[PDB]
A paper describes a structure:
Aminoglycoside (3″)(9) adenylyltransferase AadA from Salmonella enterica belongs to the ANT(3″)-Ia family and catalyzes the magnesium-dependent O-adenylation of streptomycin and spectinomycin at positions 3″ and 9, respectively. Modification of streptomycin and spectinomycin by O-phosphorylation or O-nucleotidylation prevents the drugs from binding to their respective binding sites on the ribosome (for reviews, see Refs. 9 and 10). In the apo state, AadA has a monomeric two-domain structure with the active site located between an N-terminal adenylyltransferase domain and a C-terminal helical domain.
Brief soaking of WT AadA–ATP crystals with streptomycin resulted in a 2.05-Å–resolution structure with clear density for ATP, magnesium, and the major part of streptomycin. The overall conformation of the enzyme is very similar to AadA–ATP (r.m.s.d. of 0.3 Å over 256 Cα atoms) and AadA(E87Q)–dhs (r.m.s.d. of 0.4 Å over 256 Cα atoms). The geometry of the substrates in the active site is consistent with a single-in-line displacement mechanism as suggested for kanamycin nucleotidyltransferase and LinB, but the two substrates are too far apart to represent a catalytic state according to this mechanism. Thus, the nucleophilic oxygen would normally coordinate the magnesium ion and approach 2.5-Å distance of the ATP phosphorus atom during the reaction, whereas the position of our 3″-hydroxyl in AadA–ATP–sry is at 5.1 Å from the α-phosphorus. The weak electron density for the reacting part of the substrate in the AadA–ATP–sry structure supports dynamics in this part of the substrate.
Numbering used by the authors: 3 to 262, 267 to 268
Amino acid sequence: LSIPPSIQCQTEAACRLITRVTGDTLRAIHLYGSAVAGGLKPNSDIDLLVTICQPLTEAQRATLMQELLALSSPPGASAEKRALEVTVVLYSQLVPWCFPPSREMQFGEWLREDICQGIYEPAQQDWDMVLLITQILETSIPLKGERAERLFTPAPAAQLLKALRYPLDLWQSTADVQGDEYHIVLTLARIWYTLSTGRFTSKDAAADWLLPQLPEDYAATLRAAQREYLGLEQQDWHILLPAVVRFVDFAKAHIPTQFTHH
Ligand SMILES: CN[C@@H]1[C@H](O[C@H]2[C@H](O[C@H]3[C@H](O)[C@@H](O)[C@H](NC(=N)N)[C@@H](O)[C@@H]3NC(=N)N)O[C@@H](C)[C@]2(O)C=O)O[C@@H](CO)[C@H](O)[C@H]1O
Ligand SMILES: Nc1ncnc2c1ncn2[C@@H]1O[C@H](COP(=O)(O)OP(=O)(O)OP(=O)(O)O)[C@@H](O)[C@H]1O
Ligand SMILES: [Cl-]
Ligand SMILES: [Mg+2]
Ligand SMILES: [Mg+2]
């Protein structure tokens, strides 16, 4: 797998920073997500997983958070300077697996306001870490350390199922989805795709896979979500919000409850 030339400079800067702060504790840095698996759009972020051996000191946490702010920009602000998402995890949480796994920290542009004031999310449980590692074992590039298949072990299918279906419970009310309308719709398409095929695919490809299988009313909602993500039309998602809720409820009712495996 290859790093897109148009992100190499920023990725190299992020790696030099991570190396400085972590240093002796650093086990690996893996690039994953659309930059590697495909689907890198103008607003897409650069997804990075940092594996360390010991927890981050609050000095390391503060420094890494602050200095990442200078290497990252909000999505869409710049074609050259993309949004960074850096997730840090203890190796001991993955080998052997701890369920749910915990993450030491997660930098992201949606936290810029808080990070600009010394407010850092602490370590916490995150079922999504099961999905991250699973996707990394399939499609990732080691910027530092060993390839993923030599560092991590796959999770049991039983736990991958729980991680895939866990977000379905977070989305129940209008406010649970308000603000992330098309992101949630496309993510549901990816969850549906993975549970039915055992594979991971891009947001765009998951929507195309799902559209023919939906009643037209729900296909229209998925189409509007896909259309916005691709930059072809911005919708008024306050108007579409009742239809988004109906789409979420349809997915929760129809997504498989067991693998049709990875
Ligand atoms: C970790 N990736 C970022 C994060 O994504 C999250 C995103 O999570 C969002 C929930 O759906 C939404 O209901 C939730 N909204 C509520 N009313 N509770 C958001 O707060 C939540 N975002 C968050 N905690 N950062 O949906 C999940 C499927 C996700 O992709 C997990 O990995 O947050 C998204 C923005 O919310 C960013 O666009 C992503 O880059
Ligand atoms: N079935 C799934 N397939 C892929 N990702 C999933 C799935 N279910 C949940 N997710 C989560 O959704 C998030 C997607 O991250 P992200 O928004 O960076 O997507 P991406 O593929 O990098 O596309 P983009 O170019 O928009 O960044 C991840 O945190 C991932 O764990
Ligand atoms: Cl329904
Ligand atoms: Mg991404
Ligand atoms: Mg991301």
